[PDB]
DNA sequence: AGATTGCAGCACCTGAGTTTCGCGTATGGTCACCCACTACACTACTCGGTCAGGCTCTTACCAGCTTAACTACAGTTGATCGGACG
């Protein structure tokens, strides 16, 4: 297909592979976020951001990646 | 596992935000024409002085006389004048 404007990505699965690629470990996070927040229209369950949640997802900013003070 | 049903994918008609546009309406700009005012040199008719022409008025008579005044001769006294003073 000549996928060149947003309207060419008509199929939902085609949109996700075109916008997010096929790295299996990356696609997990999208499935977790979808199930953990689809019903969260204006607010989300406290139980979903907790470190033990079945839907827990957390990406640390690059400044946190290793100790920087020294 | 079939009769009932939803998802959602395909295609084509459609709708607005956005744009480009045409005109109104009106405004500053070109430039062409012809007008007003000015003026140096000129055109030309009249007025004016001068002159002649020639018609015109007014004089004053000649010698004499006879009505009218001067116009000379003539004598003691002025006061500027010269030229020298203060």
């Amino acid at each position: 297909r000549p996928i060149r404007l947003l309207k060419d990505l008509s199929s939902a699965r085609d949109k996700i592979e075109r916008i997010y690629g096929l790295n299996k470990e990356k696609l997990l996070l999208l499935a977790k976020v979808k199930e953990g927040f689809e019903t969260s229209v204006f607010d989300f369950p406290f139980k979903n951001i907790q470190p033990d949640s079945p839907y827990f997802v957390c990406l640390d900013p690059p400044c946190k990646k290793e100790s920087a003070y020294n």
Side-chain angles (χ1 to χ4, degrees):
Chain A
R1 288 177 57 72
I3 305 178
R4 299 199 179 173
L5 293 171
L6 178 62
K7 69 189 297 287
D8 304 321
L9 295 69
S10 55
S11 168
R13 293 190 297 277
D14 293 4
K15 176 180 170 179
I16 299 302
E17 73 185 36
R18 181 57 177 97
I19 289 179
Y20 296 111
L22 294 177
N23 294 84
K24 305 302 296 189
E25 289 176 41
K26 184 170 181 164
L27 290 176
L28 296 172
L29 283 297
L30 307 187
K32 286 186 177 184
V33 172
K34 168 251 184 275
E35 203 69 2
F37 297 90
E38 171 169 359
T39 52
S40 303
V41 180
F42 302 140
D43 181 30
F44 59 91
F46 178 89
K47 300 192 292 279
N48 292 5
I49 68 170
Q50 287 294 98
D52 60 347
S53 192
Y55 310 112
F56 179 75
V57 284
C58 177
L59 290 305
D60 288 324
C63 39
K64 190 169 165 193
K65 287 286 185 176
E66 285 89 15
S67 183
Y69 181 65
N70 309 310

